[PDB]
């Protein structure tokens, strides 16, 4: 029916029921890799110029805090990174 | 913004809902599909770079109030094009198309004070001469238009306000 | 077992799509049945969404959209060592003279 909050509380109910959850802050997943550049989803608490720690012992530098992502450059061999890390 | 990319899905949904005489059902189906998009978490997932149909499925799972063929297929096509965030505007364009098809229009009335009713009768009947549609008033009050009234239908307006006179005169001077 | 599917073909550039968790790393090799001869693709970029953009080490004519693609887990590997002396090879390390197979010990 109108469900003024009924839809609102209902949608929250159902999202919890299907176990959709956000990232934590501090946390992101590699979305794209190409020619040394990285695009990361998440990291809601990354700050421009920060050092992002990849898997392995290597870092990336956050250059753009895009609306929906972070752009970063890998300081080292980028060849072995994969989407979903 | 998504006005220009909502137009095709809106037109297609409306055409379909006309051919199946189910307009009134689609309207609320789409309203619900829109409000799911506004959820704190879903909006995050909608931005994540997941494959189309996995996103489509995670979205359908949150909807039981969608008719199990046509609403799903709309959602899945929008997912294929990554345009799920456009639902809030597909809804508005669907509503506007409904208005245009039923030849029914809304007109705003902004006044210094509440009118006398028969005034509203003359206003509506003459706006039905101005416009062919069945006109639905929704009056509002503002003291800035210290006297008279503004009629605002769509984006054509008639300024009968004393404030409009006062400044339209002031710029002659 | 093949797991990817060709999604686009634009000249020598081919984009293939994989399950979201099995994306090939960069510079990995792939292969497809182009007609009735295999074709080896080298991965250049991971686009978003499980799609990966690759370059065909061969003629791309004949490639349909939707063909199956097989993910080799390693870069292009070639025969090496003494066995190669006096042979002629292409990039893939296949023999291009007629003298038959290279007696490789290692790649």
Q: What is the DSSP string of B31-59?
A: HHHHHHHTSHHHHHHHHS---HHHHHHHH
End-to-end CA distance of chain C, in Å? 22
Indicate the helix (H) or strand (E) that contains C106: none
C-alpha dist (Å) from residue B157 to B94, B149, C50: 24, 11, 52
Half-sphere exposure of residue B109: CA atoms within 13 angstroms, side-chain side: 18
Burial B106-145 (b: 16+ CB within 10 A, else e): ebebbbbeebeeeeeeebeeebeeebebebebeeeeeeeb
Question: May I ask the CATH class of domain B2-100?
Answer: mainly alpha
| Beta-carbon separation of A20 and B42 below 8 A | yes
| Beta-carbon separation of A8 and B42 below 8 A | no
Residue A59, phi-psi category: left (phi > 0), alpha (psi -120 to 50), beta (remainder): beta
Q: Which CATH architecture has domain C1-75?
A: Beta Barrel (2.40)
Q: Are the C-beta atoms of residues A41 and B48 closer than 8 Å to each other?
A: yes
**Coarse DSSP helix, strand, coil percentages of chain A, rounded to the nearest 5 percent:** 15, 30, 55
Residue labelled with tokens 């006005």: B3
Tokens of A54: 């990849």
- What Rg do the C-alpha atoms of chain C give, in angstroms? 15
> Torsion angle of alpha carbons B39, B42, B43, B46, nearest 10°?
-150
| C-alpha of B97 from chain center | 9
Indicate the helix (H) or strand (E) that contains B166: helix B162-170
**What does the alpha-carbon distance between residue A55 and residue B143 come to, in Å, rounded to a whole number?**
64
Partners of residue A33 in chain C, C-beta under 8 Å: 26, 45-46
| CA-wise closest residue to C84 among C75, C93, C74 | C93
Pick from C23, C45, C48: CB nearest A82: C23
Q: Are the C-beta atoms of residues B106 and B99 closer than 8 Å to each other?
A: yes
What topology is assigned to A1-85 in CATH? Elongation Factor Tu (Ef-tu); domain 3 (2.40.30)
C-alpha dist (Å) from residue A69 to A32, B144, C22, C29, C90: 11, 45, 22, 29, 42
C-alpha dist (Å) from residue A26 to A23, A50, A51: 9, 11, 11
**What does the alpha-carbon distance between residue C6 and residue C15 come to, in Å, rounded to a whole number?**
6
Residue length, chain B? 173
Residue C38, phi-psi category: left (phi > 0), alpha (psi -120 to 50), beta (remainder): beta
**What does the alpha-carbon distance between residue C85 and residue C87 come to, in Å, rounded to a whole number?**
6
Resolution in A: 3.4
Q: Are the C-beta atoms of residues B28 and B67 closer than 8 Å to each other?
A: no
Q: Touching C: which chains, 3+ CB pairs < 8 A?
A: A, B
| Beta-carbon separation of C48 and B52 below 8 A | no
Residue C49 sits at φ, ψ, to 5 deg, of: 85, 20
Q: Which of C16, C26, C43 to mutate to test the interface with A (most CBs of A within 10 A)?
A: C26
Q: Technique behind this structure?
A: cryo-EM
Dihedral sign for Cα atoms in the order C96, C101, C103, C105:
positive
C-alpha dist (Å) from residue C30 to A41, C18, C55: 27, 12, 10
Partners of residue B47 in chain A, C-beta under 8 Å: 41, 68
Partners of residue C48 in chain B, C-beta under 8 Å: 49
| Beta-carbon separation of A20 and B58 below 8 A | yes
| Beta-carbon separation of B39 and A15 below 8 A | yes
């Amino acid at each position: 029916q109108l469900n003024s909050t009924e839809i609102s509380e209902l949608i929250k109910q159902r999202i919890a029921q299907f176990n959709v959850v956000s990232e934590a802050h501090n946390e992101g997943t590699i979305v794209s890799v190409s020619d040394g550049v990285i695009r990361i989803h998440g990291l809601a608490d990354a700050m421009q110029g920060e050092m992002i720690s990849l898997p392995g012992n290597r870092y990336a530098i956050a250059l753009n805090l895009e609306r929906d992502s972070v752009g970063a450059v890998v300081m080292g061999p980028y060849a072995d990174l994969a989407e979903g890390m | 913004e998504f006005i220009t990319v909502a137009r095709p899905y809106a037109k297609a949904a409306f055409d379909f809902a006309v051919e199946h005489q189910s307009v009134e059902r689609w309207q609320d189906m789409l309203a619900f599909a829109a409000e799911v998009t506004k959820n704190e978490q879903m909006a995050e997932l909608l931005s994540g770079a997941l494959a189309p149909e996995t996103l489509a499925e995670s979205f359908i799972a949150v909807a039981g109030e969608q008719l199990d063929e046509n609403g799903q297929n709309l959602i899945r096509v929008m997912a294929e094009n990554g345009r799920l965030n456009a639902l809030p505007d597909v809804l508005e364009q669907f509503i506007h198309l409904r208005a245009v098809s039923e030849a029914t229009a809304e007109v705003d009335v902004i006044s210094a004070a509440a009118l006398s009713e028969q005034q509203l009768a003359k206003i509506s009947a003459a706006m039905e001469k101005r416009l062919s549609r069945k006109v639905k008033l929704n009056a509002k009050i503002d003291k800035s238009v210290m006297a008279g009234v503004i009629i605002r239908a769509g984006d054509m307006v008639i300024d009968g306000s004393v404030r409009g006179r006062l400044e339209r005169l002031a710029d002659v001077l | 077992m093949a797991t990817g599917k060709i999604v686009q073909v634009i000249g020598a550039v081919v984009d293939v799509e994989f399950p979201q968790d099995a994306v090939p790393r960069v510079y990995d090799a792939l292969e497809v049945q182009n007609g009735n001869e295999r074709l080896v693709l080298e991965v250049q970029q991971q686009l978003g969404g499980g799609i990966v953009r690759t370059i065909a080490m061969g003629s791309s004519d004949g490639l349909r959209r939707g063909l199956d693609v097989k993910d080799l887990e390693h870069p292009i590997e070639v025969p090496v060592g003494k066995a190669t002396l006096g042979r002629i090879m292409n990039v893939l390390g296949e023999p291009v003279d007629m003298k038959g197979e290279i007696g490789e010990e290692e790649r």
